[PDB]
Write an enzyme that holds these catalytic residues in place. Sequence first.
Site, short mmCIF file in Angstrom:
data_model
loop_
_atom_site.label_atom_id
_atom_site.label_comp_id
_atom_site.label_asym_id
_atom_site.label_seq_id
_atom_site.Cartn_x
_atom_site.Cartn_y
_atom_site.Cartn_z
N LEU A 36 0.72 -1.16 -0.09
CA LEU A 36 0.05 -0.04 0.09
C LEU A 36 0.91 1.39 0.04
CD1 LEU A 36 -2.88 -0.88 2.58
CD2 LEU A 36 -2.89 -0.92 0.01
N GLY A 42 10.01 2.05 6.65
CA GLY A 42 9.57 0.49 5.91
C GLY A 42 8.44 0.80 5.12
N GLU A 108 -5.51 -3.34 11.95
CA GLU A 108 -6.75 -3.45 11.47
C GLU A 108 -6.69 -2.45 9.88
OE1 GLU A 108 -10.04 -2.08 13.66
OE2 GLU A 108 -11.55 -2.75 12.14
N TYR A 109 -7.35 -3.09 9.10
CA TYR A 109 -7.35 -2.34 7.62
C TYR A 109 -8.37 -1.37 7.80
CZ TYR A 109 -7.82 -1.31 2.75
OH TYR A 109 -7.73 -0.90 1.48
N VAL A 110 -7.92 0.11 7.60
CA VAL A 110 -8.92 1.07 7.54
C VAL A 110 -8.46 1.91 6.08
CG1 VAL A 110 -9.34 3.22 8.68
CG2 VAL A 110 -8.79 1.13 9.97
N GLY A 113 -8.41 7.41 4.16
CA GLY A 113 -7.40 8.55 4.24
C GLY A 113 -7.54 9.21 5.51
N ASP A 153 -0.58 15.19 20.65
CA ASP A 153 -0.36 15.10 19.21
C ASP A 153 -1.25 15.32 18.39
OD1 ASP A 153 1.13 15.36 17.11
OD2 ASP A 153 1.77 13.27 16.79
N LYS A 155 -4.08 16.61 15.89
CA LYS A 155 -4.00 17.41 14.55
C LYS A 155 -4.43 16.38 13.55
CE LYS A 155 0.94 15.48 13.36
NZ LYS A 155 2.28 15.98 13.37
N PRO A 156 -5.14 17.32 12.42
CA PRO A 156 -5.97 16.37 11.17
C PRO A 156 -5.22 15.34 10.65
CG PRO A 156 -6.12 19.01 11.38
CD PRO A 156 -4.92 18.76 12.23
N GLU A 157 -3.75 15.43 10.67
CA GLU A 157 -3.21 14.26 9.89
C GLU A 157 -3.15 13.09 10.72
OE1 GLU A 157 0.65 15.27 7.97
OE2 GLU A 157 0.27 17.58 8.49
N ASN A 158 -3.30 12.97 12.05
CA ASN A 158 -3.34 11.86 12.90
C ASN A 158 -5.01 11.33 13.08
OD1 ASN A 158 -0.82 11.83 13.17
ND2 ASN A 158 -0.68 12.73 15.09
#
Length: 324
Positions: A36, A42, A108-110, A113, A153, A155-158
Amino acid sequence: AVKEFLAKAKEDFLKKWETPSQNTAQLDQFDRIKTLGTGSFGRVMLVKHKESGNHYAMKILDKQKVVKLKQIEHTLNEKRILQAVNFPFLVKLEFSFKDNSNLYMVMEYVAGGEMFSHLRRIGRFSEPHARFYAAQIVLTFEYLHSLDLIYRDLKPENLLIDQQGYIQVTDFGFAKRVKGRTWTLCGTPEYLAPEIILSKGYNKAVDWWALGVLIYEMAAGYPPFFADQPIQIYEKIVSGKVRFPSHFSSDLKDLLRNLLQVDLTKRFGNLKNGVNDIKNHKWFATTDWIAIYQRKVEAPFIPYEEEEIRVSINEKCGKEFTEF
């Protein structure tokens, strides 16, 4: 009843915090569907458990790169927290293991975005849309704070949005178990509470400040304190003066004035009533708190040359990652 649910959750958290689970799977138990993405340490791969048939997102961390980038402590801390927490709006770590070369965190697959990208694609959120997300953070921080965890921490990115349209918080490198004060400067400047900048020590109250900044950005389309240089953002944060857009409701502006309170002894979430001063605020009057926790409220918005994994004969960085 809420107090006894948190009391049971903390007992369960302390058990796994005291005895973290290790090596709950191995690499040859998973089929490698597709990569992905390639990241800092990594690669992330979509995988399928051979027996159960379920799909998972496997993060592979090259132990040597983690050491070079001075991210040893952050990596071990995130894994220890994730294997011990349990809450609907936290990313679930299903398996973890290591070998001679890499660390492995099977998540778990999320699909769906980060919030940062969606926020720049839509522009800004309507107040009911934002409240749906804010309510989830409130319950999440109520949970983490009850474990004595400072997320620090936010923030929208998290914040990812899953296919169900709900929030899942992802990055726990900075999260620290603190009962008194702490001093480490970390996090994005736009979301730093003033007591962090002043370097006088801070506690869980910085998370509620970050929630204040987050709600503002969602409802306005831009953060409350911003400038070209961090030092200018710091000045605006400590000054405390906030300007609200015209379309902000009266309730929203009142909530933000109490969350973005420069004095942490006057900040909502840090008073005698704790999180209930936030839950009982007029802006959340239409919010069914139990329904949000149960994921019953309808979401406002719903979202090739493969390389091999080389496992060296030599053990790499065995001393550094013993506890993983």
